[PDB]
Design a protein around this ligand. Structure first.
Ligand SMILES: [Mg+2]
Ligand SMILES: [Mg+2]
Ligand SMILES: [Mg+2]
Ligand SMILES: [Mg+2]
Ligand SMILES: [Mg+2]
Ligand SMILES: [Mg+2]
Ligand SMILES: [Mg+2]
Ligand SMILES: [Mg+2]
Ligand SMILES: [Mg+2]
Ligand SMILES: [Mg+2]
Ligand SMILES: [Mg+2]
Ligand SMILES: [Mg+2]
Ligand SMILES: [Mg+2]
Ligand SMILES: [Mg+2]
Ligand SMILES: [Mg+2]
Ligand SMILES: [Mg+2]
Ligand SMILES: [Mg+2]
Ligand SMILES: [Mg+2]
Ligand SMILES: [Mg+2]
Ligand SMILES: [Mg+2]
Ligand SMILES: [Mg+2]
Ligand SMILES: [Mg+2]
Ligand SMILES: [Mg+2]
Ligand SMILES: [Mg+2]
Ligand SMILES: [Mg+2]
Ligand SMILES: [Mg+2]
Ligand SMILES: [Mg+2]
Ligand SMILES: [Mg+2]
Ligand SMILES: [Mg+2]
Ligand SMILES: [Mg+2]
Ligand SMILES: [Mg+2]
Ligand SMILES: [Mg+2]
Ligand SMILES: [Mg+2]
Ligand SMILES: [Mg+2]
Ligand SMILES: [Mg+2]
Ligand SMILES: [Mg+2]
Ligand SMILES: [Mg+2]
Ligand SMILES: [Mg+2]
Ligand SMILES: [Mg+2]
Ligand SMILES: [Mg+2]
Ligand SMILES: [Mg+2]
Ligand SMILES: [Mg+2]
Ligand SMILES: [Mg+2]
Ligand SMILES: [Mg+2]
Ligand SMILES: [Mg+2]
Ligand SMILES: [Mg+2]
Ligand SMILES: [Mg+2]
Ligand SMILES: [Mg+2]
Ligand SMILES: [Mg+2]
Ligand SMILES: [Mg+2]
Ligand SMILES: [Mg+2]
Ligand SMILES: [Mg+2]
Ligand SMILES: [Mg+2]
Ligand SMILES: [Mg+2]
Ligand SMILES: [Mg+2]
Ligand SMILES: [Mg+2]
Ligand SMILES: [Mg+2]
Ligand SMILES: [Mg+2]
Ligand SMILES: [Mg+2]
Ligand SMILES: [Mg+2]
Ligand SMILES: [Mg+2]
Ligand SMILES: [Mg+2]
Ligand SMILES: [Mg+2]
Ligand SMILES: [Mg+2]
Ligand SMILES: [Mg+2]
Ligand SMILES: [Mg+2]
Ligand SMILES: [Mg+2]
Ligand SMILES: [Mg+2]
Ligand SMILES: [Mg+2]
Ligand SMILES: [Mg+2]
Ligand SMILES: [Mg+2]
Ligand SMILES: [Mg+2]
Ligand SMILES: [Mg+2]
Ligand SMILES: [Mg+2]
Ligand SMILES: [Mg+2]
Ligand SMILES: [Mg+2]
Ligand SMILES: [Mg+2]
Ligand SMILES: [Mg+2]
Ligand SMILES: [Mg+2]
Ligand SMILES: [Mg+2]
Ligand SMILES: [Mg+2]
Ligand SMILES: [Mg+2]
Ligand SMILES: [Mg+2]
Ligand SMILES: [Mg+2]
Ligand SMILES: [Mg+2]
Ligand SMILES: [Mg+2]
Ligand SMILES: [Mg+2]
Ligand SMILES: [Mg+2]
Ligand SMILES: [Mg+2]
Ligand SMILES: [Mg+2]
Ligand SMILES: [Mg+2]
Ligand SMILES: [Mg+2]
Ligand SMILES: [Mg+2]
Ligand SMILES: [Mg+2]
Ligand SMILES: [Mg+2]
Ligand SMILES: [Mg+2]
Ligand SMILES: [Mg+2]
Ligand SMILES: [Mg+2]
Ligand SMILES: [Mg+2]
Ligand SMILES: [Mg+2]
Ligand SMILES: [Mg+2]
Ligand SMILES: [Mg+2]
Ligand SMILES: [Mg+2]
Ligand SMILES: [Mg+2]
Ligand SMILES: [Mg+2]
Ligand SMILES: [Mg+2]
Ligand SMILES: [Mg+2]
Ligand SMILES: [Mg+2]
Ligand SMILES: [Mg+2]
Ligand SMILES: [Mg+2]
Ligand SMILES: [Mg+2]
Ligand SMILES: [Mg+2]
Ligand SMILES: [Mg+2]
Ligand SMILES: [Mg+2]
Ligand SMILES: [Mg+2]
Ligand SMILES: [Mg+2]
Ligand SMILES: [Mg+2]
Ligand SMILES: [Mg+2]
Ligand SMILES: [Mg+2]
Ligand SMILES: [Mg+2]
Ligand SMILES: [Mg+2]
Ligand SMILES: [Mg+2]
Ligand SMILES: [Mg+2]
Ligand SMILES: [Mg+2]
Ligand SMILES: [Mg+2]
Ligand SMILES: [Mg+2]
Ligand SMILES: [Mg+2]
Ligand SMILES: [Mg+2]
Ligand SMILES: [Mg+2]
Ligand SMILES: [Mg+2]
Ligand SMILES: [Mg+2]
Ligand SMILES: [Mg+2]
Ligand SMILES: [Mg+2]
Ligand SMILES: [Mg+2]
Ligand SMILES: [Mg+2]
Ligand SMILES: [Mg+2]
Ligand SMILES: [Mg+2]
Ligand SMILES: [Mg+2]
Ligand SMILES: [Mg+2]
Ligand SMILES: [Mg+2]
Ligand SMILES: [Mg+2]
Ligand SMILES: [Mg+2]
Ligand SMILES: [Mg+2]
Ligand SMILES: [Mg+2]
Ligand SMILES: [Mg+2]
Ligand SMILES: [Mg+2]
Ligand SMILES: [Mg+2]
Ligand SMILES: [Mg+2]
Ligand SMILES: [Mg+2]
Ligand SMILES: [Mg+2]
Ligand SMILES: [Mg+2]
Ligand SMILES: [Mg+2]
Ligand SMILES: [Mg+2]
Ligand SMILES: [Mg+2]
Ligand SMILES: [Mg+2]
Ligand SMILES: [Mg+2]
Ligand SMILES: [Mg+2]
Ligand SMILES: [Mg+2]
Ligand SMILES: [Mg+2]
Ligand SMILES: [Mg+2]
Ligand SMILES: [Mg+2]
Ligand SMILES: [Mg+2]
Ligand SMILES: [Mg+2]
Ligand SMILES: [Mg+2]
Ligand SMILES: [Mg+2]
Ligand SMILES: [Mg+2]
Ligand SMILES: [Mg+2]
Ligand SMILES: [Mg+2]
Ligand SMILES: [Mg+2]
Ligand SMILES: [Mg+2]
Ligand SMILES: [Mg+2]
Ligand SMILES: [Mg+2]
Ligand SMILES: [Mg+2]
Ligand SMILES: [Mg+2]
Ligand SMILES: [Zn+2]
Lengths: 151, 140, 59, 112, 101, 116
RNA sequence: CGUGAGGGAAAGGUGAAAAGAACCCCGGGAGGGGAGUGAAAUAGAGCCUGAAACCGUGGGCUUACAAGCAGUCACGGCCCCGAGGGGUUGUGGCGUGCCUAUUGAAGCAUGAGCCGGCGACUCACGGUCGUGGGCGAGCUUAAGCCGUUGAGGCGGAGGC
RNA sequence: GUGGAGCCUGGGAGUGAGGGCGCGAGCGAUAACGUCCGCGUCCGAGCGCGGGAACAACCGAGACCGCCAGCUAAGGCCCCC
RNA sequence: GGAUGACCCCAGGCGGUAGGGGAGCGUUCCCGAUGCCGAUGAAGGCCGACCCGCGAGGGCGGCUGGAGGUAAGGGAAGUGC
């Protein structure tokens, strides 16, 4: 704290409480006791745990009938309205939130600005994103790499 | 069901002839009569006892040698101001007070106990001035 | 001396009970027989300058 | 109908003035004026003026009749205090509060 | 006529038309119950020894409730012992139907 | 994140002060003095519920006594007699009788004199 | 503030917009009362909200024969709201502040004028028990590298 | 003898200023609201409740809450009560 | 008893300082949330003799206030004077 270390007044005989300096947390304007300092909240969750979590996350959406794999994306070539077309053809009105996993950039860029769509490259597949969304939509290309990461 | 509480009732006047009675033994009974504890609707927080006229206080009686040995005592608040008055002398100078002081000490202390002492009227000699209330002559 | 000092803060009730004698009494006034104005008795009327039924002082 | 005046921030002490205000509560306008005139106190000046402003309002803004007017309410409030140093013996400084008043007079009409 | 009846460990003087709260009775609201009798009074006088044999008072149960909350508080000095408990005693509300003497 | 006192403390003092409404001087005005007063009031309360059960019984007893000595016996003899008779009317109810229904009470007196 | 080295504060908020109140009235002024502006002026500049201590006016109840840790329990009177509640308190019963420190405090032992806000068991890395899970004669990566731009993976050196 | 009994392995303590009373001793003066031990008890922590005028440790008794119900304990029952 | 916190019946325990253990209340912040409550009135402030909870509290309603607030379930602390 910015203040100095001087004893503001003598120890005895003033008729006031004894104090040292005004950096003491007991003073308004003094330093704070056990406040936060910078911290690293990260830790190494076991790899196998992450893997099972990734398996189960997808498996859950499968049991729900919510997992859908697609072969390709028709005429969607970067324009959002194109995705919306394709969406409809596959049952995606947007009454349900979707996690779209594909390596095709132009599909991701199209679908991205939507409120109800989250977009991922397959190496980015992760369980928080899986649980967040009501429906899982994966390119075959993606499903293959998801396969590699879990076995 | 909550306990009965009387409405303010008319107090009976009562007459007692103190002649020849024992000082303290008369006293307890006057106190009881003053509280009103002889009344089934007794209530401790209101003045509802009887009024008591007493005559012949000067001819009250006491046992043992207390005539010369009962000392009544009074402190004035000044240094050396504790006067001592033997029973004999109190009879001879303010006889009615012997009975009064005895009764006073047997009533509860506090504002209510002090008003019940007022309801007691003590006379030396055969007579009193309370004809107007036509007091009922009790035995005790 | 040993610097006497109050032992307890005085209650609102007791400070105000000390003040139970502090009320001002209204000034005592009588009409002036000439100009009817209210004035202290036994003083020269400061409105019209009369006292004792004659003009005494220039108001 | 009522008419009022308030003198806010008068540099006199609330407790002192109230003494004077106590004299006029419930008097006719004529009586209070008389009383104030011969009250040997500083605050009688200030109360006089708050009164006269109120009577002005009553007559001139509120269709009341000067000759029906009476002090229906009057009260003194305490405003912000002025803090000043009063230097004492042996290096010590005391702090004097120079106190302040918000003076109010409220006039009504006495019917009949 | 009145009757002295005994319910919930306590006794009460009751009469036709009387509303009474007593310790909660195990009885559906609207139902009817017979209270034991210790003494009948008024015109005739019969003294129970302790109860009277033929007698009973009928009561229609109006319903059950919880009383106004009492704050039961505890405190011990120089020990930091303090407790605050809230209490509402259950009751049953009865109307006295008849004194079957 | 920092959690200042904010709103919480005021609301705790108010709770107390309301409970203290009606107390003299600072005892309804200062939070601290209220709390002292309320500890007393709480132990006084609890104790006085207990004590109230006693207090009334003692009044019931004094009352039964007066109406007993109207028929030539004392409370102590009375209670003995009812006891032998098997009359279990409580002192609360006896008292109502002694004032409200003096005939019925006299009867109870009768039975108690009989029972010994 | 200190000779000096040096110490070292307090102090944010009208309104959407100044539309910041022409003009008249009392006043020396301050201040106010009207008029006016504004959705709002106890938003009027001593300006969002406006708690508490604290001071005041008005109203109900109450108090000048009364003995008190100030309450509580009972009853009665008066006042308010409409077989009930609320306020007040005459009488009666009971009744030794809080905290701290102590063998023991109402204690004539400590601390506290009162109110508001600040104010004291934390975090990192190791360790040891317990616990929720992953794998199991196995378990696990560190720095780093790649990818993301709040996406995760690789990395077996090493540790148990 | 099934008890907030007992034993074993581990985690967390606090305490390591006691005090009155009864009995058995030493010290002192067959002194101290004295001191130091032994067995016990209560207070400590039961300064909650009844009795002892008032009073931690004497007598009665181990307070979960509510009731305008009943029986008792010590102690009491002429009035205060 | 039903079958595993569904509730019911019966029985016992429930004074407490140091201290051990258990279960909760609330404050700031994050996920829930491109959501939802909000000018037909956010937060906060002042009331209530009303409701729910053993309690810490949580509702509801009237007045003030004038633009924010944030659920079920979880996460993290500058968390209660
Ligand atoms: Mg520094
Ligand atoms: Mg500096
Ligand atoms: Mg420095
Ligand atoms: Mg330094
Ligand atoms: Mg130094
Ligand atoms: Mg220094
Ligand atoms: Mg010193
Ligand atoms: Mg000092
Ligand atoms: Mg000081
Ligand atoms: Mg100091
Ligand atoms: Mg110092
Ligand atoms: Mg310091
Ligand atoms: Mg220092
Ligand atoms: Mg410092
Ligand atoms: Mg420092
Ligand atoms: Mg700082
Ligand atoms: Mg600063
Ligand atoms: Mg700073
Ligand atoms: Mg701090
Ligand atoms: Mg620190
Ligand atoms: Mg520090
Ligand atoms: Mg830290
Ligand atoms: Mg860092
Ligand atoms: Mg950690
Ligand atoms: Mg790390
Ligand atoms: Mg979403
Ligand atoms: Mg999106
Ligand atoms: Mg007699
Ligand atoms: Mg009594
Ligand atoms: Mg004489
Ligand atoms: Mg006496
Ligand atoms: Mg007494
Ligand atoms: Mg001297
Ligand atoms: Mg001197
Ligand atoms: Mg000298
Ligand atoms: Mg001096
Ligand atoms: Mg002093
Ligand atoms: Mg004061
Ligand atoms: Mg006052
Ligand atoms: Mg005084
Ligand atoms: Mg004249
Ligand atoms: Mg004068
Ligand atoms: Mg004029
Ligand atoms: Mg001062
Ligand atoms: Mg000053
Ligand atoms: Mg029963
Ligand atoms: Mg019940
Ligand atoms: Mg204690
Ligand atoms: Mg204490
Ligand atoms: Mg105490
Ligand atoms: Mg304590
Ligand atoms: Mg202690
Ligand atoms: Mg305590
Ligand atoms: Mg409490
Ligand atoms: Mg704060
Ligand atoms: Mg704080
Ligand atoms: Mg607060
Ligand atoms: Mg608090
Ligand atoms: Mg608040
Ligand atoms: Mg609160
Ligand atoms: Mg009061
Ligand atoms: Mg007060
Ligand atoms: Mg006061
Ligand atoms: Mg106040
Ligand atoms: Mg109780
Ligand atoms: Mg008691
Ligand atoms: Mg009992
Ligand atoms: Mg007899
Ligand atoms: Mg018996
Ligand atoms: Mg019996
Ligand atoms: Mg210097
Ligand atoms: Mg200088
Ligand atoms: Mg310096
Ligand atoms: Mg400073
Ligand atoms: Mg600053
Ligand atoms: Mg603004
Ligand atoms: Mg602005
Ligand atoms: Mg002008
Ligand atoms: Mg002018
Ligand atoms: Mg002007
Ligand atoms: Mg004006
Ligand atoms: Mg103006
Ligand atoms: Mg307008
Ligand atoms: Mg509007
Ligand atoms: Mg306002
Ligand atoms: Mg405003
Ligand atoms: Mg201001
Ligand atoms: Mg604003
Ligand atoms: Mg303001
Ligand atoms: Mg203000
Ligand atoms: Mg205020
Ligand atoms: Mg007043
Ligand atoms: Mg007298
Ligand atoms: Mg009087
Ligand atoms: Mg006394
Ligand atoms: Mg009574
Ligand atoms: Mg009452
Ligand atoms: Mg009432
Ligand atoms: Mg009392
Ligand atoms: Mg006691
Ligand atoms: Mg005391
Ligand atoms: Mg004591
Ligand atoms: Mg305290
Ligand atoms: Mg403390
Ligand atoms: Mg302390
Ligand atoms: Mg000490
Ligand atoms: Mg010491
Ligand atoms: Mg000592
Ligand atoms: Mg004292
Ligand atoms: Mg003292
Ligand atoms: Mg000292
Ligand atoms: Mg002290
Ligand atoms: Mg010391
Ligand atoms: Mg000071
Ligand atoms: Mg104060
Ligand atoms: Mg404070
Ligand atoms: Mg720790
Ligand atoms: Mg572990
Ligand atoms: Mg694993
Ligand atoms: Mg190692
Ligand atoms: Mg045990
Ligand atoms: Mg054990
Ligand atoms: Mg066992
Ligand atoms: Mg631990
Ligand atoms: Mg240790
Ligand atoms: Mg220790
Ligand atoms: Mg020692
Ligand atoms: Mg030792
Ligand atoms: Mg020892
Ligand atoms: Mg021991
Ligand atoms: Mg002793
Ligand atoms: Mg012996
Ligand atoms: Mg011995
Ligand atoms: Mg020995
Ligand atoms: Mg000798
Ligand atoms: Mg010793
Ligand atoms: Mg000895
Ligand atoms: Mg010895
Ligand atoms: Mg011992
Ligand atoms: Mg200790
Ligand atoms: Mg004991
Ligand atoms: Mg023990
Ligand atoms: Mg006693
Ligand atoms: Mg005792
Ligand atoms: Mg005792
Ligand atoms: Mg004891
Ligand atoms: Mg027990
Ligand atoms: Mg009941
Ligand atoms: Mg018995
Ligand atoms: Mg015995
Ligand atoms: Mg005795
Ligand atoms: Mg007796
Ligand atoms: Mg049980
Ligand atoms: Mg248990
Ligand atoms: Mg316990
Ligand atoms: Mg447990
Ligand atoms: Mg909180
Ligand atoms: Mg919580
Ligand atoms: Mg913040
Ligand atoms: Mg943040
Ligand atoms: Mg959001
Ligand atoms: Mg939002
Ligand atoms: Mg809406
Ligand atoms: Mg609007
Ligand atoms: Mg509104
Ligand atoms: Mg909030
Ligand atoms: Mg907030
Ligand atoms: Mg609330
Ligand atoms: Mg609000
Ligand atoms: Mg905004
Ligand atoms: Mg939230
Ligand atoms: Mg939540
Ligand atoms: Mg979560
Ligand atoms: Mg802190
Ligand atoms: Zn003249």
């Amino acid at each position: 704290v910015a203040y100095s270390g001087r004893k503001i007044w003598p120890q005895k005989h003033t008729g006031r409480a004894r104090h040292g300096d005004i950096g003491a947390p007991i003073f308004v304007g003094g330093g704070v006791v056990f406040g936060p300092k910078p911290r690293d909240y990260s830790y190494t969750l076991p790899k196998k745990v992450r893997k099972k979590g990734l398996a189960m996350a997808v498996a859950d959406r499968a049991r729900e009938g919510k997992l859908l794999l697609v072969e390709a994306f028709a005429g969607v070539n970067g324009k959002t309205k194109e995705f919306l077309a394709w969406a409809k053809e596959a049952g995606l009105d947007g009454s349900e939130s979707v996690l779209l996993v594909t390596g095709n950039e132009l599909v991701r860029r199209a679908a991205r600005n939507l409120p109800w769509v989250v977009t991922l490259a397959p190496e980015g597949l992760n369980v928080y994103d899986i649980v967040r969304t009501e429906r899982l939509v994966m390119d075959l290309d993606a499903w293959e790499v998801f396969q590699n990461r879990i076995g | 069901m909550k306990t009965y509480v009387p409405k303010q009732v008319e107090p009976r006047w009562v007459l007692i002839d103190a002649e020849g009675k024992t000082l303290g033994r008369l006293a307890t009974k006057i106190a009881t009569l003053l509280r009103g504890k002889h009344r089934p609707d007794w209530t401790p927080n209101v003045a509802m006892g009887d009024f008591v006229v007493v005559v012949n206080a000067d001819k009250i009686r006491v046992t043992g040698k207390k005539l010369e040995q009962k000392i009544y005592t009074r402190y004035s608040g000044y240094p050396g101001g504790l006067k001592k008055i033997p029973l004999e002398k109190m009879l001879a100078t303010h006889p009615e007070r012997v009975l009064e002081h005895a009764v006073k000490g047997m009533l509860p202390k506090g504002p209510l106990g002090r008003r019940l002492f007022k309801r007691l009227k003590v006379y030396a000699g055969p007579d009193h001035p309370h004809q107007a209330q036509r007091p009922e002559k009790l035995e005790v | 001396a040993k610097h006497p000092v109050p032992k307890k803060k005085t209650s609102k009730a007791r400070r105000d009970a000390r003040r139970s004698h502090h009320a001002l009494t209204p000034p005592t006034l009588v009409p002036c027989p000439e100009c009817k104005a209210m004035k202290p008795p036994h003083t020269v009327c400061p409105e019209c300058g009369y006292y004792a039924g004659r003009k005494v002082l220039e108001v | 109908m009522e008419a009022k005046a308030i003198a806010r921030y008068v540099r006199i002490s609330p407790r002192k003035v109230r003494l004077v205000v106590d004299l006029i509560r419930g008097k006719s306008l004529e009586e209070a004026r008389n009383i104030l005139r011969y009250t040997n106190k500083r605050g009688a000046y200030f109360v006089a003026k708050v009164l006269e402003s109120a009577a002005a309002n009553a007559v001139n803004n509120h269709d009341m009749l000067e000759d029906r007017l009476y002090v229906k309410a009057a009260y003194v409030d305490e405003g912000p205090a002025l803090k000043r140093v009063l230097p004492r013996a042996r290096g010590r400084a005391d702090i004097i509060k120079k106190r302040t008043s918000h003076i109010t007079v409220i006039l009504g009409e006495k019917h009949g | 006529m009145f009757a002295i009846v005994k319910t919930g460990g306590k006794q009460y003087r009751v009469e036709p038309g009387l509303k009474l709260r007593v310790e909660k009775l195990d009885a559906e609201p609207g139902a009817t119950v017979e209270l034991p009798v210790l003494l009948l009074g008024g015109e005739k006088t019969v003294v129970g020894t302790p109860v009277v044999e033929g007698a009973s008072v009928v009561a229609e149960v109006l319903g059950h409730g919880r009383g106004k909350k009492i704050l039961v508080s505890k405190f011990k000095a120089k020990v930091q012992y303090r407790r605050k408990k809230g209490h509402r005693q259950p009751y049953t509300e009865l109307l006295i139907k008849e004194i079957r003497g | 994140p920092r959690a200042k006192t904010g709103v919480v403390r005021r609301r705790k003092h108010k709770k107390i002060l309301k409970l203290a409404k009606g107390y003299w001087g600072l005892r309804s005005k200062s939070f601290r003095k209220a709390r002292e007063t309320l500890f007393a009031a709480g132990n006084y309360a609890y104790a006085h519920r207990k004590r109230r059960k006693r207090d009334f019984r003692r009044l019931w007893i004094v009352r039964i006594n007066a109406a007993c000595r109207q028929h030539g016996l004392n409370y102590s003899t009375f209670i003995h007699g009812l006891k032998k008779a098997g009359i279990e009317v409580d002192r609360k109810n006896l008292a109502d009788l002694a004032v409200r229904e003096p005939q019925v009470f006299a009867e109870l007196v009768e039975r108690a004199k009989a029972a010994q």
